[PDB]
Every structure is written in structure tokens, then in C-alpha cells.
């Protein structure tokens, strides 16, 4: 409640898409997740659903945020706060509000908080090739993604004061647990095109077919009944977490460039380490001495972003995001100047 002025001013227009997440980072002193978490969890009314106190949530938001590495350029508490902000925005839209249930809204916002917890600034491929402690632990299969979720529940349940899932029912926790685990694991990029195709075939194409009839009262109930099933809700949740995770190209141009520079720096550190240690170079194009950042961002957007957000926009209707995507894409094209 009693938040100091600079941090309180940074979180004024937090419902809006245009949000100064880096002012919050500077204001909070690399602690943006706890302050943004407090307001976001309260606004939805998550501790009323979970039956937790304010002090239980503060201890929970603290211990996860401590395990986020400040040394990492991109994968830190500020990134998870940006994803949490993106998550809440998509949940607040009319398509997602009317489709999803309150249990799903809680699972999404919790998942966004923990999805990259204890990131080593490195990819899965690096850890498998290096023979890391977690690579051997998870058998070179969803190494980081399983570690993020597994460690998050170890921190939450393992300590009594940190446990936000203390007063819940037996059935309510397991459905919530299965929901959070699935959304965190869905962020793995090897299954990127799998999660995009399953979204288009099961949601968008049926919804496109049903919309041919019109806006009749009986037909809207069929659109409701079809989307609101457990299978399709999960596919919407898998798509929502994926989009919010890589929503930085759809931000305002200042933030887009900042997110681009940070993730690029995190690769150059990895590429320098792989050369010195004598590991196989899994990311050859992302080297500080040869990489074009503008040209790299164009390749990333064309491969991952453009087709995914096309599907997500067609479903949810996101005119601000797709307009920013067009403005940022053309800016990266303009920086060649040769
Ligand atoms: N803007 C981005 N550019 C590039 Cl090359 N990779 C990015 C960008 N934003 C996110 N990523 C990557 O996407 C993955 C998370 O979905 C991570 O491996 C890494 F963060
Ligand atoms: Mg990930
Ligand atoms: Zn992520």
C-alpha cells in the first residue's frame, strides 16, 4: 500500500500497453517484479482467490525476485515484470475475459512471474553441450523450462511463510498447478511451431467458419461452447504465455530497441564463452564482432513473431501491438543505410 512516490508514479498507467518498464526498473533498483506484482495481483484479486494475506504474497514475490539473476542483461526480474504486464493486458481484453475462467487468469499471472526464474543467461543447447548440472538433471529435455517451474514450487511450498498456496483446496491447487506447469513449459522454443499450429487449427479456423453465419444469438452460444472447453482454453493459455514472453517487438520503439540490445548482449557473452571453452557454436550469427543487430531482429520477427502475433491478433484484436510491430520492423530496415 505505502509505496514511495517515484515507484508509485512509474506504475500509474499500468493498464495501458505503453508502459515505462525501465523507469520502474531504475526506480525500484532492479526490483520491479515485487511492486508491479503487488498491484497486479490485487487488481485482479488473486489473494482473495488463493486465500493468502498480503505478507504471504510479499514474501513470495521477494524470494522469486531474489533468484532472478541481476547479472543477466535480458533474463532478469525486469523481463518477468514486462511479461507479467503483457500477460495482464491480454487477460484484460474482451475475447480472453469472456472465454477464460477466473482460475485461468490466476494461473497466467503466476506463470508470468516464475517462467524464467533462476536463468543462467544461457540457452538449453549450451547446457546440454557443456554437460551442466541441470542438463544432466533434466536429461537434455526442456532443461531450463522444467527447472524454472520446479524451482518456483520448491521456493513457494518449501517455506511456510512464502507459500501462497497454503489455504487452497486439494482439487483447486492441482488444477492450478497443472495449469501453471503447462504454460511455463509451453515457452520452450523447440515446440514453437507446434503451439502456433494447434492454436490456428483448433481455434481460429473453427471461429472463422462459425463467423460466416452472422451474429445470431444461437450461433454465438456455439462459438462460446466450443472455445470454453478445457482443451481449447489450454491452447489459448499456451498462446497467451508465448506471445507475452516475446512481446518486445510489439512495444513502443524505445523499449523495442532496449529489449533488442539486452538479448543481443546475452548471446555475445554465450558465443565468447563457447569459443574459449571449446564447445560447439550453436549460435554462430550472434557474435559481437560480426552480428548486425537490426538485421538479426528482422530475421527473428519473420521466423517467430509475425506468424504467431497474426494468429493472436485475429483472435484477440490487438491494433496497438501490430501497429508498433510495423513501426519497429521498418525502423530495423531503415538502419542499414547502405
Ligand atoms: N527480440 C528478440 N530477439 C531475439 Cl534474436 N531473440 C529474442 C528476442 N526476444 C526474445 N528472444 C528469445 O526468445 C526466447 C524466449 O521465447 C529466448 O530464447 C530469447 F529471449
Ligand atoms: Mg523460456
Ligand atoms: Zn521468457
mmCIF file of C-alpha atoms and ligand atoms in Angstrom:
data_model
loop_
_atom_site.group_PDB
_atom_site.id
_atom_site.type_symbol
_atom_site.label_atom_id
_atom_site.label_comp_id
_atom_site.label_asym_id
_atom_site.label_seq_id
_atom_site.Cartn_x
_atom_site.Cartn_y
_atom_site.Cartn_z
ATOM 1 C CA UNK A 1 0.000 0.000 0.000
ATOM 2 C CA UNK A 2 2.532 2.609 1.194
ATOM 3 C CA UNK A 3 4.648 2.746 -1.982
ATOM 4 C CA UNK A 4 7.213 5.593 -2.318
ATOM 5 C CA UNK A 5 6.463 8.375 -4.887
ATOM 6 C CA UNK A 6 8.849 7.669 -7.831
ATOM 7 C CA UNK A 7 7.886 3.968 -7.984
ATOM 8 C CA UNK A 8 4.192 4.892 -7.497
ATOM 9 C CA UNK A 9 4.396 7.370 -10.423
ATOM 10 C CA UNK A 10 6.061 4.691 -12.603
ATOM 11 C CA UNK A 11 3.044 2.349 -12.144
ATOM 12 C CA UNK A 12 0.289 4.920 -12.935
ATOM 13 C CA UNK A 13 -0.745 3.884 -16.464
ATOM 14 C CA UNK A 14 -0.110 0.146 -15.927
ATOM 15 C CA UNK A 15 -3.414 -0.951 -17.510
ATOM 16 C CA UNK A 16 -2.160 0.688 -20.756
ATOM 17 C CA UNK A 17 0.133 -1.034 -23.286
ATOM 18 C CA UNK A 18 2.527 1.939 -23.494
ATOM 19 C CA UNK A 19 4.299 1.398 -20.150
ATOM 20 C CA UNK A 20 7.719 2.625 -18.965
ATOM 21 C CA UNK A 21 9.006 -0.682 -17.530
ATOM 22 C CA UNK A 22 12.637 0.587 -17.474
ATOM 23 C CA UNK A 23 11.752 3.648 -15.361
ATOM 24 C CA UNK A 24 10.218 1.148 -12.900
ATOM 25 C CA UNK A 25 13.483 -0.874 -13.015
ATOM 26 C CA UNK A 26 15.540 2.253 -12.247
ATOM 27 C CA UNK A 27 13.017 3.460 -9.629
ATOM 28 C CA UNK A 28 12.756 0.111 -7.801
ATOM 29 C CA UNK A 29 16.561 -0.521 -8.027
ATOM 30 C CA UNK A 30 16.292 -3.741 -10.053
ATOM 31 C CA UNK A 31 13.206 -4.845 -8.065
ATOM 32 C CA UNK A 32 10.286 -4.156 -10.487
ATOM 33 C CA UNK A 33 8.527 -7.557 -10.097
ATOM 34 C CA UNK A 34 7.518 -7.153 -6.414
ATOM 35 C CA UNK A 35 5.982 -3.658 -6.840
ATOM 36 C CA UNK A 36 4.234 -4.442 -10.143
ATOM 37 C CA UNK A 37 3.217 -7.839 -8.694
ATOM 38 C CA UNK A 38 1.523 -6.267 -5.645
ATOM 39 C CA UNK A 39 -0.742 -4.042 -7.778
ATOM 40 C CA UNK A 40 -1.457 -6.646 -10.497
ATOM 41 C CA UNK A 41 -2.291 -9.448 -8.009
ATOM 42 C CA UNK A 42 -4.531 -7.029 -6.048
ATOM 43 C CA UNK A 43 -6.303 -5.550 -9.116
ATOM 44 C CA UNK A 44 -7.444 -8.985 -10.347
ATOM 45 C CA UNK A 45 -7.992 -10.089 -6.723
ATOM 46 C CA UNK A 46 -5.698 -13.114 -6.650
ATOM 47 C CA UNK A 47 -5.096 -13.439 -2.869
ATOM 48 C CA UNK A 48 -8.902 -13.494 -2.386
ATOM 49 C CA UNK A 49 -8.990 -16.490 -4.781
ATOM 50 C CA UNK A 50 -5.895 -18.162 -3.259
ATOM 51 C CA UNK A 51 -6.889 -17.138 0.324
ATOM 52 C CA UNK A 52 -3.480 -15.582 1.131
ATOM 53 C CA UNK A 53 -2.584 -12.499 3.175
ATOM 54 C CA UNK A 54 -0.580 -9.504 1.903
ATOM 55 C CA UNK A 55 2.519 -10.561 3.905
ATOM 56 C CA UNK A 56 2.469 -14.074 2.355
ATOM 57 C CA UNK A 57 2.442 -12.522 -1.150
ATOM 58 C CA UNK A 58 5.249 -10.038 -0.309
ATOM 59 C CA UNK A 59 7.463 -12.882 0.969
ATOM 60 C CA UNK A 60 6.603 -14.894 -2.179
ATOM 61 C CA UNK A 61 7.334 -12.036 -4.612
ATOM 62 C CA UNK A 62 10.630 -11.322 -2.772
ATOM 63 C CA UNK A 63 12.122 -14.857 -2.788
ATOM 64 C CA UNK A 64 11.403 -15.466 -6.515
ATOM 65 C CA UNK A 65 12.769 -11.993 -7.434
ATOM 66 C CA UNK A 66 15.986 -12.691 -5.476
ATOM 67 C CA UNK A 67 16.527 -15.879 -7.536
ATOM 68 C CA UNK A 68 16.300 -13.818 -10.764
ATOM 69 C CA UNK A 69 19.904 -13.019 -11.752
ATOM 70 C CA UNK A 70 20.678 -9.271 -11.890
ATOM 71 C CA UNK A 71 23.921 -10.090 -13.777
ATOM 72 C CA UNK A 72 21.900 -11.243 -16.832
ATOM 73 C CA UNK A 73 21.217 -8.459 -19.400
ATOM 74 C CA UNK A 74 17.811 -9.744 -20.611
ATOM 75 C CA UNK A 75 16.650 -12.686 -18.453
ATOM 76 C CA UNK A 76 16.114 -10.971 -15.082
ATOM 77 C CA UNK A 77 13.265 -9.737 -12.800
ATOM 78 C CA UNK A 78 12.537 -6.777 -15.136
ATOM 79 C CA UNK A 79 11.853 -9.154 -18.048
ATOM 80 C CA UNK A 80 9.410 -11.233 -15.942
ATOM 81 C CA UNK A 81 7.714 -7.978 -14.853
ATOM 82 C CA UNK A 82 7.386 -6.992 -18.544
ATOM 83 C CA UNK A 83 5.895 -10.438 -19.326
ATOM 84 C CA UNK A 84 3.590 -10.093 -16.275
ATOM 85 C CA UNK A 85 2.478 -6.704 -17.656
ATOM 86 C CA UNK A 86 1.912 -8.265 -21.110
ATOM 87 C CA UNK A 87 0.010 -11.197 -19.540
ATOM 88 C CA UNK A 88 -2.375 -8.925 -17.591
ATOM 89 C CA UNK A 89 -3.020 -6.857 -20.747
ATOM 90 C CA UNK A 90 -4.138 -9.904 -22.773
ATOM 91 C CA UNK A 91 -6.301 -11.201 -19.889
ATOM 92 C CA UNK A 92 -7.973 -7.749 -19.694
ATOM 93 C CA UNK A 93 -9.122 -7.928 -23.368
ATOM 94 C CA UNK A 94 -12.763 -8.858 -24.095
ATOM 95 C CA UNK A 95 -12.043 -12.072 -26.061
ATOM 96 C CA UNK A 96 -9.860 -13.554 -23.289
ATOM 97 C CA UNK A 97 -12.072 -12.292 -20.419
ATOM 98 C CA UNK A 98 -15.277 -13.887 -21.781
ATOM 99 C CA UNK A 99 -13.517 -17.136 -22.849
ATOM 100 C CA UNK A 100 -11.321 -17.917 -19.807
ATOM 101 C CA UNK A 101 -12.411 -18.586 -16.209
ATOM 102 C CA UNK A 102 -11.035 -16.853 -13.047
ATOM 103 C CA UNK A 103 -8.828 -19.904 -12.252
ATOM 104 C CA UNK A 104 -7.034 -19.435 -15.617
ATOM 105 C CA UNK A 105 -6.394 -15.706 -15.010
ATOM 106 C CA UNK A 106 -4.585 -16.581 -11.748
ATOM 107 C CA UNK A 107 -2.560 -19.369 -13.419
ATOM 108 C CA UNK A 108 -1.435 -16.961 -16.177
ATOM 109 C CA UNK A 109 -0.249 -14.144 -13.881
ATOM 110 C CA UNK A 110 1.560 -16.593 -11.547
ATOM 111 C CA UNK A 111 3.175 -18.339 -14.557
ATOM 112 C CA UNK A 112 4.404 -14.980 -15.936
ATOM 113 C CA UNK A 113 6.134 -14.227 -12.603
ATOM 114 C CA UNK A 114 8.118 -17.527 -12.493
ATOM 115 C CA UNK A 115 8.610 -18.544 -16.172
ATOM 116 C CA UNK A 116 12.362 -17.634 -16.329
ATOM 117 C CA UNK A 117 13.287 -17.883 -12.606
ATOM 118 C CA UNK A 118 16.994 -18.687 -11.996
ATOM 119 C CA UNK A 119 18.027 -18.180 -15.645
ATOM 120 C CA UNK A 120 21.821 -18.565 -16.166
ATOM 121 C CA UNK A 121 21.862 -16.114 -19.134
ATOM 122 C CA UNK A 122 22.299 -19.167 -21.395
ATOM 123 C CA UNK A 123 20.266 -21.385 -23.752
ATOM 124 C CA UNK A 124 19.250 -25.047 -23.324
ATOM 125 C CA UNK A 125 21.662 -26.090 -26.124
ATOM 126 C CA UNK A 126 24.612 -24.550 -24.215
ATOM 127 C CA UNK A 127 23.862 -26.547 -21.041
ATOM 128 C CA UNK A 128 23.391 -29.859 -22.895
ATOM 129 C CA UNK A 129 26.680 -29.387 -24.796
ATOM 130 C CA UNK A 130 28.546 -28.129 -21.690
ATOM 131 C CA UNK A 131 27.164 -31.000 -19.567
ATOM 132 C CA UNK A 132 25.697 -28.747 -16.876
ATOM 133 C CA UNK A 133 24.242 -29.839 -13.512
ATOM 134 C CA UNK A 134 20.677 -29.102 -14.712
ATOM 135 C CA UNK A 135 21.236 -30.642 -18.190
ATOM 136 C CA UNK A 136 22.099 -33.979 -16.541
ATOM 137 C CA UNK A 137 19.218 -33.437 -14.063
ATOM 138 C CA UNK A 138 16.592 -32.988 -16.844
ATOM 139 C CA UNK A 139 18.152 -35.355 -19.450
ATOM 140 C CA UNK A 140 18.728 -32.698 -22.182
ATOM 141 C CA UNK A 141 14.932 -32.227 -22.486
ATOM 142 C CA UNK A 142 13.287 -28.906 -21.513
ATOM 143 C CA UNK A 143 16.250 -28.254 -19.195
ATOM 144 C CA UNK A 144 15.614 -24.618 -18.228
ATOM 145 C CA UNK A 145 11.801 -24.727 -18.668
ATOM 146 C CA UNK A 146 11.451 -27.653 -16.229
ATOM 147 C CA UNK A 147 13.993 -26.003 -13.878
ATOM 148 C CA UNK A 148 12.027 -22.701 -13.815
ATOM 149 C CA UNK A 149 8.750 -24.356 -12.767
ATOM 150 C CA UNK A 150 10.337 -26.970 -10.456
ATOM 151 C CA UNK A 151 12.433 -24.398 -8.554
ATOM 152 C CA UNK A 152 9.465 -21.982 -8.345
ATOM 153 C CA UNK A 153 7.350 -24.562 -6.475
ATOM 154 C CA UNK A 154 10.393 -25.566 -4.350
ATOM 155 C CA UNK A 155 10.671 -21.928 -3.177
ATOM 156 C CA UNK A 156 6.903 -21.478 -2.660
ATOM 157 C CA UNK A 157 5.902 -24.728 -0.896
ATOM 158 C CA UNK A 158 9.293 -25.456 0.758
ATOM 159 C CA UNK A 159 8.982 -22.447 3.099
ATOM 160 C CA UNK A 160 5.744 -21.849 5.057
ATOM 161 C CA UNK A 161 5.836 -18.013 5.028
ATOM 162 C CA UNK A 162 6.435 -17.961 1.228
ATOM 163 C CA UNK A 163 3.609 -20.448 0.449
ATOM 164 C CA UNK A 164 0.789 -18.577 -1.337
ATOM 165 C CA UNK A 165 -0.908 -21.980 -1.976
ATOM 166 C CA UNK A 166 -1.368 -22.647 1.772
ATOM 167 C CA UNK A 167 -5.131 -22.324 2.353
ATOM 168 C CA UNK A 168 -6.393 -23.705 -1.015
ATOM 169 C CA UNK A 169 -8.486 -26.845 -1.568
ATOM 170 C CA UNK A 170 -6.924 -30.154 -2.648
ATOM 171 C CA UNK A 171 -8.617 -30.122 -6.082
ATOM 172 C CA UNK A 172 -8.223 -26.349 -6.680
ATOM 173 C CA UNK A 173 -4.430 -26.488 -6.180
ATOM 174 C CA UNK A 174 -3.834 -29.459 -8.530
ATOM 175 C CA UNK A 175 -5.830 -27.930 -11.421
ATOM 176 C CA UNK A 176 -3.964 -24.637 -10.811
ATOM 177 C CA UNK A 177 -0.617 -26.493 -10.558
ATOM 178 C CA UNK A 178 -1.244 -28.397 -13.817
ATOM 179 C CA UNK A 179 -2.198 -25.089 -15.499
ATOM 180 C CA UNK A 180 0.914 -23.164 -14.362
ATOM 181 C CA UNK A 181 3.275 -26.072 -15.214
ATOM 182 C CA UNK A 182 1.811 -26.325 -18.749
ATOM 183 C CA UNK A 183 2.141 -22.579 -19.515
ATOM 184 C CA UNK A 184 5.759 -22.388 -18.245
ATOM 185 C CA UNK A 185 6.721 -25.479 -20.309
ATOM 186 C CA UNK A 186 4.920 -24.046 -23.387
ATOM 187 C CA UNK A 187 7.542 -21.232 -23.623
ATOM 188 C CA UNK A 188 10.148 -23.766 -24.901
ATOM 189 C CA UNK A 189 11.084 -22.632 -28.433
ATOM 190 C CA UNK A 190 11.626 -26.152 -29.870
ATOM 191 C CA UNK A 191 7.828 -26.557 -29.574
ATOM 192 C CA UNK A 192 7.179 -23.043 -31.018
ATOM 193 C CA UNK A 193 5.597 -24.062 -34.330
ATOM 194 C CA UNK A 194 3.673 -26.891 -32.608
ATOM 195 C CA UNK A 195 1.906 -24.442 -30.247
ATOM 196 C CA UNK A 196 1.191 -21.955 -33.085
ATOM 197 C CA UNK A 197 -0.309 -24.591 -35.438
ATOM 198 C CA UNK A 198 -2.507 -26.102 -32.693
ATOM 199 C CA UNK A 199 -3.864 -22.586 -31.978
ATOM 200 C CA UNK A 200 -4.782 -21.837 -35.628
ATOM 201 C CA UNK A 201 -6.350 -25.249 -36.403
ATOM 202 C CA UNK A 202 -8.401 -25.640 -33.183
ATOM 203 C CA UNK A 203 -9.479 -22.003 -32.525
ATOM 204 C CA UNK A 204 -9.036 -19.576 -35.450
ATOM 205 C CA UNK A 205 -10.270 -21.758 -38.349
ATOM 206 C CA UNK A 206 -13.381 -23.027 -36.471
ATOM 207 C CA UNK A 207 -14.058 -19.454 -35.258
ATOM 208 C CA UNK A 208 -13.644 -18.192 -38.850
ATOM 209 C CA UNK A 209 -16.095 -20.870 -40.084
ATOM 210 C CA UNK A 210 -18.699 -20.127 -37.371
ATOM 211 C CA UNK A 211 -18.465 -16.345 -38.043
ATOM 212 C CA UNK A 212 -19.751 -16.919 -41.635
ATOM 213 C CA UNK A 213 -23.310 -17.410 -40.282
ATOM 214 C CA UNK A 214 -23.501 -13.980 -38.601
ATOM 215 C CA UNK A 215 -24.168 -12.547 -35.130
ATOM 216 C CA UNK A 216 -27.267 -14.614 -34.251
ATOM 217 C CA UNK A 217 -27.984 -15.499 -30.592
ATOM 218 C CA UNK A 218 -27.875 -19.294 -31.102
ATOM 219 C CA UNK A 219 -24.656 -19.123 -33.174
ATOM 220 C CA UNK A 220 -22.736 -17.065 -30.556
ATOM 221 C CA UNK A 221 -23.540 -19.783 -27.975
ATOM 222 C CA UNK A 222 -21.865 -22.375 -30.263
ATOM 223 C CA UNK A 223 -18.839 -20.026 -30.524
ATOM 224 C CA UNK A 224 -18.898 -19.787 -26.695
ATOM 225 C CA UNK A 225 -19.365 -23.535 -26.032
ATOM 226 C CA UNK A 226 -16.605 -24.553 -28.490
ATOM 227 C CA UNK A 227 -13.923 -22.149 -27.187
ATOM 228 C CA UNK A 228 -14.755 -22.579 -23.465
ATOM 229 C CA UNK A 229 -13.848 -26.335 -23.391
ATOM 230 C CA UNK A 230 -10.772 -27.406 -21.300
ATOM 231 C CA UNK A 231 -8.709 -28.346 -24.400
ATOM 232 C CA UNK A 232 -9.156 -25.028 -26.255
ATOM 233 C CA UNK A 233 -8.693 -22.962 -23.052
ATOM 234 C CA UNK A 234 -5.269 -24.606 -22.603
ATOM 235 C CA UNK A 235 -4.388 -23.789 -26.247
ATOM 236 C CA UNK A 236 -5.373 -20.133 -25.610
ATOM 237 C CA UNK A 237 -3.253 -20.169 -22.415
ATOM 238 C CA UNK A 238 -0.310 -21.737 -24.311
ATOM 239 C CA UNK A 239 -0.654 -18.984 -26.951
ATOM 240 C CA UNK A 240 -1.086 -16.142 -24.412
ATOM 241 C CA UNK A 241 2.068 -17.053 -22.429
ATOM 242 C CA UNK A 242 4.068 -17.447 -25.679
ATOM 243 C CA UNK A 243 3.009 -14.043 -27.059
ATOM 244 C CA UNK A 244 3.548 -12.130 -23.784
ATOM 245 C CA UNK A 245 7.018 -13.706 -23.446
ATOM 246 C CA UNK A 246 8.204 -12.327 -26.831
ATOM 247 C CA UNK A 247 6.025 -9.167 -26.948
ATOM 248 C CA UNK A 248 9.076 -6.818 -27.039
ATOM 249 C CA UNK A 249 8.929 -6.316 -30.853
ATOM 250 C CA UNK A 250 5.292 -5.139 -30.410
ATOM 251 C CA UNK A 251 6.293 -2.459 -27.814
ATOM 252 C CA UNK A 252 6.978 1.282 -28.390
ATOM 253 C CA UNK A 253 10.230 1.891 -30.305
ATOM 254 C CA UNK A 254 12.327 2.973 -27.267
ATOM 255 C CA UNK A 255 11.561 -0.286 -25.431
ATOM 256 C CA UNK A 256 11.871 -2.471 -28.564
ATOM 257 C CA UNK A 257 15.443 -1.216 -29.126
ATOM 258 C CA UNK A 258 16.327 -1.652 -25.419
ATOM 259 C CA UNK A 259 14.998 -5.249 -25.296
ATOM 260 C CA UNK A 260 16.835 -5.961 -28.585
ATOM 261 C CA UNK A 261 20.178 -4.683 -27.228
ATOM 262 C CA UNK A 262 19.860 -6.687 -23.978
ATOM 263 C CA UNK A 263 19.043 -10.088 -25.541
ATOM 264 C CA UNK A 264 21.747 -9.473 -28.195
ATOM 265 C CA UNK A 265 24.336 -8.789 -25.450
ATOM 266 C CA UNK A 266 23.303 -12.048 -23.718
ATOM 267 C CA UNK A 267 24.209 -14.003 -26.903
ATOM 268 C CA UNK A 268 27.613 -12.342 -27.360
ATOM 269 C CA UNK A 269 28.536 -13.431 -23.811
ATOM 270 C CA UNK A 270 27.437 -17.001 -24.665
ATOM 271 C CA UNK A 271 29.282 -17.044 -28.025
ATOM 272 C CA UNK A 272 32.528 -15.796 -26.402
ATOM 273 C CA UNK A 273 32.250 -18.498 -23.697
ATOM 274 C CA UNK A 274 31.557 -21.322 -26.211
ATOM 275 C CA UNK A 275 34.698 -20.387 -28.212
ATOM 276 C CA UNK A 276 37.033 -20.221 -25.180
ATOM 277 C CA UNK A 277 35.771 -23.432 -23.517
ATOM 278 C CA UNK A 278 35.782 -25.268 -26.890
ATOM 279 C CA UNK A 279 32.062 -26.070 -27.161
ATOM 280 C CA UNK A 280 30.121 -26.446 -30.442
ATOM 281 C CA UNK A 281 28.967 -22.972 -31.541
ATOM 282 C CA UNK A 282 25.153 -23.297 -31.581
ATOM 283 C CA UNK A 283 24.644 -19.532 -32.182
ATOM 284 C CA UNK A 284 27.234 -18.512 -34.844
ATOM 285 C CA UNK A 285 25.356 -15.479 -36.278
ATOM 286 C CA UNK A 286 25.075 -13.823 -32.821
ATOM 287 C CA UNK A 287 28.721 -12.777 -32.278
ATOM 288 C CA UNK A 288 29.677 -9.216 -31.188
ATOM 289 C CA UNK A 289 32.436 -8.957 -33.842
ATOM 290 C CA UNK A 290 30.132 -9.929 -36.784
ATOM 291 C CA UNK A 291 26.425 -9.547 -35.793
ATOM 292 C CA UNK A 292 24.131 -6.921 -37.292
ATOM 293 C CA UNK A 293 21.506 -6.288 -34.585
ATOM 294 C CA UNK A 294 18.946 -4.623 -36.949
ATOM 295 C CA UNK A 295 19.310 -7.472 -39.487
ATOM 296 C CA UNK A 296 19.199 -10.060 -36.662
ATOM 297 C CA UNK A 297 15.918 -8.592 -35.341
ATOM 298 C CA UNK A 298 14.330 -8.755 -38.830
ATOM 299 C CA UNK A 299 15.183 -12.484 -39.042
ATOM 300 C CA UNK A 300 13.761 -13.099 -35.540
ATOM 301 C CA UNK A 301 10.490 -11.259 -36.327
ATOM 302 C CA UNK A 302 9.932 -13.029 -39.686
ATOM 303 C CA UNK A 303 10.636 -16.512 -38.263
ATOM 304 C CA UNK A 304 8.875 -16.409 -34.851
ATOM 305 C CA UNK A 305 6.870 -13.208 -34.296
ATOM 306 C CA UNK A 306 4.971 -12.280 -37.497
ATOM 307 C CA UNK A 307 3.016 -15.550 -37.919
ATOM 308 C CA UNK A 308 2.359 -16.009 -34.167
ATOM 309 C CA UNK A 309 1.008 -12.497 -33.482
ATOM 310 C CA UNK A 310 -1.013 -12.682 -36.741
ATOM 311 C CA UNK A 311 -2.964 -15.575 -35.182
ATOM 312 C CA UNK A 312 -3.097 -13.899 -31.742
ATOM 313 C CA UNK A 313 -4.310 -10.596 -33.278
ATOM 314 C CA UNK A 314 -7.026 -12.304 -35.368
ATOM 315 C CA UNK A 315 -8.408 -13.869 -32.159
ATOM 316 C CA UNK A 316 -7.970 -11.089 -29.556
ATOM 317 C CA UNK A 317 -7.859 -7.893 -31.722
ATOM 318 C CA UNK A 318 -4.625 -6.007 -30.922
ATOM 319 C CA UNK A 319 -4.425 -2.851 -33.110
ATOM 320 C CA UNK A 320 -1.766 -1.086 -30.965
ATOM 321 C CA UNK A 321 0.645 -4.066 -30.904
ATOM 322 C CA UNK A 322 0.513 -4.782 -34.656
ATOM 323 C CA UNK A 323 0.921 -1.063 -35.487
ATOM 324 C CA UNK A 324 4.034 -0.939 -33.254
ATOM 325 C CA UNK A 325 5.290 -4.133 -34.944
ATOM 326 C CA UNK A 326 5.031 -2.369 -38.338
ATOM 327 C CA UNK A 327 6.806 0.749 -36.983
ATOM 328 C CA UNK A 328 9.632 -1.259 -35.358
ATOM 329 C CA UNK A 329 10.124 -3.579 -38.371
ATOM 330 C CA UNK A 330 10.543 -0.610 -40.745
ATOM 331 C CA UNK A 331 12.978 1.040 -38.276
ATOM 332 C CA UNK A 332 15.239 -2.059 -38.375
ATOM 333 C CA UNK A 333 15.074 -1.912 -42.204
ATOM 334 C CA UNK A 334 15.942 1.817 -42.160
ATOM 335 C CA UNK A 335 19.133 1.339 -40.078
ATOM 336 C CA UNK A 336 21.035 -0.367 -42.965
ATOM 337 C CA UNK A 337 21.691 2.979 -44.741
ATOM 338 C CA UNK A 338 23.902 1.391 -47.461
HETATM 339 N N1 LIG B 1 13.978 -9.568 -29.670
HETATM 340 C C1 LIG B 1 14.495 -10.797 -29.572
HETATM 341 N N2 LIG B 1 15.447 -11.149 -30.464
HETATM 342 C C2 LIG B 1 15.935 -12.382 -30.373
HETATM 343 CL CL1 LIG B 1 17.141 -12.776 -31.555
HETATM 344 N N3 LIG B 1 15.642 -13.364 -29.531
HETATM 345 C C3 LIG B 1 14.697 -12.979 -28.666
HETATM 346 C C4 LIG B 1 14.087 -11.740 -28.612
HETATM 347 N N4 LIG B 1 13.146 -11.697 -27.594
HETATM 348 C C5 LIG B 1 13.204 -12.897 -27.070
HETATM 349 N N5 LIG B 1 14.112 -13.727 -27.672
HETATM 350 C C6 LIG B 1 14.359 -15.134 -27.365
HETATM 351 O O1 LIG B 1 13.111 -15.789 -27.273
HETATM 352 C C7 LIG B 1 13.197 -16.887 -26.336
HETATM 353 C C8 LIG B 1 12.010 -16.837 -25.401
HETATM 354 O O2 LIG B 1 10.797 -17.148 -26.073
HETATM 355 C C9 LIG B 1 14.569 -16.787 -25.659
HETATM 356 O O3 LIG B 1 15.459 -17.782 -26.150
HETATM 357 C C10 LIG B 1 15.053 -15.396 -26.035
HETATM 358 F F1 LIG B 1 14.630 -14.476 -25.068
HETATM 359 MG MG1 LIG B 2 11.950 -19.931 -21.892
HETATM 360 ZN ZN1 LIG B 3 10.878 -15.931 -21.268
#
